Amino acid sequence: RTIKVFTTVDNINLHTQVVDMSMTYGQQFGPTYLDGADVTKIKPHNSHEGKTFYVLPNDDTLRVEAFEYYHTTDPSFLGRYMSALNHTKKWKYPQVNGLTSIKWADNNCYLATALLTLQQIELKFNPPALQDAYYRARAGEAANFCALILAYCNKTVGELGDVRETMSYLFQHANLDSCKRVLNVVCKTCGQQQTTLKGVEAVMYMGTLSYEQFKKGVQIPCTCGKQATKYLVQQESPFVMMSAPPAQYELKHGTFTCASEYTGNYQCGHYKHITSKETLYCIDGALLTKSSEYKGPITDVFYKENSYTTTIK
Ligand SMILES: O=C(Nc1cccc2ccccc12)c1cccnc1
Ligand SMILES: [Cl-]
Ligand SMILES: [Zn+2]
Structure with missing residues (x-):
């Protein structure tokens, strides 16, 4: 006693199977799913004929x-x-x-x-x-x-x-x-050190939310024990993501694409989304509010880009 079913891993390429209706999917295929539902322990029903199962x-x-x-x-x-x-x-x-x-x-x-x-x-x-x-x-x-x-x-x-x-x-x-990203780190003591980043590392930065401040320069620890300055020499990417530990930050209409806000404690907080369009829209899942100004604990800001070269020599 049998039905015809199809197994798949990609839901495009199908593999014809004839299954014994007295045995579990598990006993015939190993772990088996029907549109996300685990049917490993279930026996074939007639309503399954011609259906696709993931294996x-x-x-x-x-x-x-x-x-x-x-x-x-x-x-x-x-x-x-x-x-x-x-x-x-x-x-x-x-x-x-x-x-x-x-x-x-x-x-x-x-x-x-x-x-x-x-x-x-x-x-x-x-x-x-x-x-x-x-x-x-x-x-x-x-x-x-x-x-x-x-x-x-x-x-x-x-x-x-x-x-x-x-x-x-x-x-x-x-x-x-x-x-592509080119960075320069200036230590008064130690002089200069240019870095090139490629791919994902070229579009992500942790330590400031401000694309403008990244361009002017940010203070970072040097091995000598002084504070060194890091600024953006060159950028080729369609966007950049600027990230930082969550801290009160003012998002100014027209100066960014979108941002993420994180409220609360470690592993038990809540994210909201802010998009800069004709005004500032705060999208919180299904919920929408608008404001001309926005201040909150911002973690990430996305900015448009194409090509940037510093004027700093
Ligand atoms: O700490 C968080 N995120 C982080 C933001 C910025 C810097 C971080 C450094 C280390 C670990 C988490 C970080 C966090 C915690 C719980 C839920 N979502 C996020
Ligand atoms: Cl795509
Ligand atoms: Zn130094």
Whole structure:
């Protein structure tokens, strides 16, 4: 007694299977999922005929398909993706000021601000999984994209992540190869030291939120025990992300693209998103407020860029 089903790792390439309806999916395929639901311990029902089940990439055909689609060989990746999807499928993705947001659930505030940020910066993903899911998220169906971020970042639904760390992981899977940064560190004692950064390290800085201050210079520790000055010589990138420990900061309309605000304590706080459009909009999941001025505990600010060369000699 049998039905026909299809197994997959990428939901595109299907593998015809004939399953014994007296045995679990588990006994025939190993761990098995139906649109995120774990059916490993369940026996085939007739309503399953012709349906697609996810399985683990446990032969060379599935390994090649999984790597080509996801760009990861982490063995627990597919199970993490399916477990998250089972939750993200039931989140709400309301359109807020023309952007896909996420209604608050399960500490997902860091994800909502990350998703809102992506839709305001020029970025293309390398893994087809992220390309296809990000296209759907932009159209309003973000369940797959959210599940993939959770899986790539090794975060479970319910865990509060850091926005900067999350953007860092997503940038590693994006085409930032054109991006270039040149830095100069001046110590009165020790003189000068020029650094070039490439890719992800060229678009991220930790220590100040102000793109203008980065250009004029910021004080950092030197090994000699003095304070050295670091400023921006040259930048080629479509955006920059300036990050700092959360601290009261004033966001001025028209001077930035968007920003992330973090309120509260370590691992038990809340992120909000601020976008600079015709005014300052504060997007907090499904919630929207406006103001002409904004002050809060800002962690990250995104700025547009193309090409910058310092006048500092
Ligand atoms: O401390 C946080 N984020 C961070 C911001 C800036 C610098 C940090 C340095 C080390 C660890 C966390 C940092 C944090 C804690 C809980 C939830 N989300 C974020
Ligand atoms: Cl993309
Ligand atoms: Zn020095």
